[PDB]
């Protein structure tokens, strides 16, 4: 497990790669994979939908079981569930959605959940439909995460911009 290869080292504990996170998980077999989730743990698009489809909807049925007892998650909160065939554990983290007016300061609180796990395979948080600048999100990651995080970035153009600014 944790057979990470081909990653570019940005800091002493942050690594980056231009790759598909679902294909990486099947190749690395990580201990933890991170899901960019919403407060109701509905995996209907983005990274969440791709992970759930790779689990043949096993992630969605487990997520609904957790919501039935916990209710909605808080922005910046997280929960650890099973990783099914993709990893041992899946950490669902809810970043702030600046389109809904949620505070961008809460992105530090979202990344702080990574410090509960020794090594993670993760995407960037609060980007895309959550509306935060991906370069800003990566800045908050390298500033708050003290454990080993391996970042998969799908877009080649975005990948080159992040590398040019952080290496």
UniProtKB/Swiss-Prot annotation:
Superkingdom of origin: Viruses
Start and end residues of each Macro domain: 1-167
Location in or out of the cell: Host endoplasmic reticulum membrane
Topology relative to the membrane: Multi-pass membrane protein
Regulation: Inhibited in vitro by GRL-0617.
Catalytic activities: Thiol-dependent hydrolysis of ester, thioester, amide, peptide and isopeptide bonds formed by the C-terminal Gly of ubiquitin (a 76-residue protein attached to proteins as an intracellular targeting signal)
UniProt subunit comment: May form homohexamers. Interacts with N protein.
UniProt function note: Responsible for the cleavages located at the N-terminus of the replicase polyprotein. Participates together with nsp4 in the assembly of virally-induced cytoplasmic double-membrane vesicles necessary for viral replication. Antagonizes innate immune induction of type I interferon by blocking the phosphorylation, dimerization and subsequent nuclear translocation of host IRF3. Also prevents host NF-kappa-B signaling. In addition, PL-PRO possesses a deubiquitinating/deISGylating activity and processes both 'Lys-48'- and 'Lys-63'-linked polyubiquitin chains from cellular substrates.
Protein name: Papain-like protease nsp3
Native source species: Severe acute respiratory syndrome coronavirus 2
Record gene name: rep
């Amino acid at each position: 497990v944790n057979s990470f290869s081909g990653y570019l080292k940005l800091t002493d504990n942050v690594y980056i790669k231009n790759a598909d996170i679902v294909e990486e998980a099947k190749k690395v077999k990580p201990t933890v994979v991170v899901n960019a989730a919403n407060v109701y743990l509905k995996h209907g698009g983005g990274v969440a939908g791709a992970l759930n489809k790779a689990t043949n909807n096993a992630m969605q049925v487990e997520s609904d079981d957790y919501i039935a007892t916990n209710g909605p998650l808080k922005v910046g909160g997280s929960c650890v569930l099973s990783g099914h065939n993709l990893a041992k554990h899946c950490l669902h983290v809810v970043g702030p959605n600046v389109n809904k007016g949620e505070d961008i300061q809460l992105l530090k609180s979202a990344y702080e959940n990574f410090n509960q796990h020794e090594v993670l395979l993760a995407p960037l948080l609060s980007a895309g439909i959550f509306g935060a600048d991906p370069i800003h999100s990566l800045r908050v990651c390298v500033d708050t995460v003290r454990t080993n995080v391996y970042l998969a970035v799908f877009d080649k153009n975005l990948y080159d911009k992040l590398v040019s600014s952080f290496l």
